[PDB]
Design a protein around this ligand. Structure first.
Ligand SMILES: CC(C)C[C@H](N)C(=O)O
Ligand SMILES: [Cl-]
Ligand SMILES: [Mg+2]
Length: 364
């Protein structure tokens, strides 16, 4: 007998360039927690249902997890774009959802069953602008690009634009693209003609990486910030050596000295031969929230005897009250499921000259 927890992430489509890191973190969590006896001796079982890259696929994944797989709760989905459409399904069904990395404004407000462990754009994004200004205090002109079809990208770009204004910089253009675009020559040229000192990009991974590459090909020599959608080594293959120097804010640090981060990090490094990425840590934290909440609930009200609809409701109620020492740091939730998290960082892509390899260097 095991306790089923649903994992609804992008395992296929270009969204999987982000989702696969999340899957990796979730699998590390499953082993970590089951090796510690699961929920008071009862193992958990992660049940994966691929969302693919759109809303319909996410709705289908959630419905399958809820109705066929009988899960006690869901971790997912990968994108805020998907969450706004699908999370209301879980809300109506009274099934908890813990979002690992969805950072658009308004996610926890979807309802009483929606929480997230990922700090939102309003507190994550401004740090990369400040870091750019530290590296070049003479930045004056900023060009901003965003994916107009993606909910998170639109939420993120609003924060970047406000931060640019608040820092006293000139916003010379805001250019739009689609996440499915591969070619950005017109928008890139239009921006380059305005002589920006800083370019900020809010998109996802393939699109963001292609845009970075093209900006450099077209002669742009200034600073570049990527938003959360570019926060994966999967961009390295796309922009190659021309990824070098991109600044990306982080809600996780491999060097954070929490005991569980040490264990998580060591497990990750031993397997994948590199530092754990943010998205992996966030997915681990989401699973941790469920395991530790299930343990707390089970101690007060043995879960093997609770019928599923009540188990879901009691688990949701419990998880919202918990305090968790996670790879992300000590976190907890507000009454509406927003994360409470203290520390943020900025990293910078450092490519080897040949462009075939790179890493994220954390700024001090
Ligand atoms: C995987 C991440 C890039 C997702 C993004 N933070 C969002 O809210 O959609
Ligand atoms: Cl295109
Ligand atoms: Mg909520």
């Amino acid at each position: 007998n095991t306790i089923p927890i649903g994992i609804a992430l992008a395992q296929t489509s270009n969204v999987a360039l982000l989702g696969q890191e999340q899957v990796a973190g979730a699998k590390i969590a499953e082993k970590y927690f089951n090796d510690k006896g699961g929920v008071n001796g009862t193992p958990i079982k992660l049940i994966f249902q691929d969302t693919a890259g759109d809303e319909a696929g996410t709705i289908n994944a959630f419905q399958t997890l809820i109705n066929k797989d009988k899960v006690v709760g869901i971790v997912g989905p990968t994108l805020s774009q998907q969450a706004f459409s699908a999370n209301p399904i879980a809300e109506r069904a009274k099934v908890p959802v813990v979002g690992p990395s969805n950072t658009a404004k308004g996610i926890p407000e979807i309802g009483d069953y929606v929480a997230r462990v990922s700090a939102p754009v309003s507190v994550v994004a401004p740090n990369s602008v400040k870091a750019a200004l530290k590296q070049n205090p003479n930045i004056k002109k900023v060009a901003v690009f965003f994916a107009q079809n993606d909910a998170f990208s639109k939420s993120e770009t609003e924060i970047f634009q406000q931060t640019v204004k608040d820092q006293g910089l000139e916003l010379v253009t805001v250019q739009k693209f689609q996440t499915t675009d591969t070619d950005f020559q017109s928008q890139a040229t239009n921006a380059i003609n305005l002589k920006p000192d800083l370019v900020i990009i809010s998109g996802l991974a393939a699109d963001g990486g292609n845009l970075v590459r093209q900006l450099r090909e077209l002669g742009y020599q200034g600073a570049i910030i990527g938003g959360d959608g570019l926060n994966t080594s999967n961009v390295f293959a796309v922009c190659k050596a021309l990824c070098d120097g991109v600044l990306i804010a982080q809600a996780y640090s491999p060097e954070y000295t929490g005991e569980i981060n040490k264990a998580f990090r060591q497990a990750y490094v031993d397997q994948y031969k590199k530092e754990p990425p943010q998205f992996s840590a966030q997915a681990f934290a989401a699973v941790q929230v469920y395991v530790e909440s299930l343990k707390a609930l089970d101690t007060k009200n043995k879960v093997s005897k609770i019928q599923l609809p009540e188990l879901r409701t009691e688990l949701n109620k419990q998880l919202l009250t918990g305090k968790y020492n996670t790879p992300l740091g000590e976190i907890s939730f507000t009454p509406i499921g927003e994360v409470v998290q203290k520390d943020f960082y900025v990293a910078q892509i450092k490519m080897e000259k040949d462009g075939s390899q790179g890493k994220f260097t954390f700024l001090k």
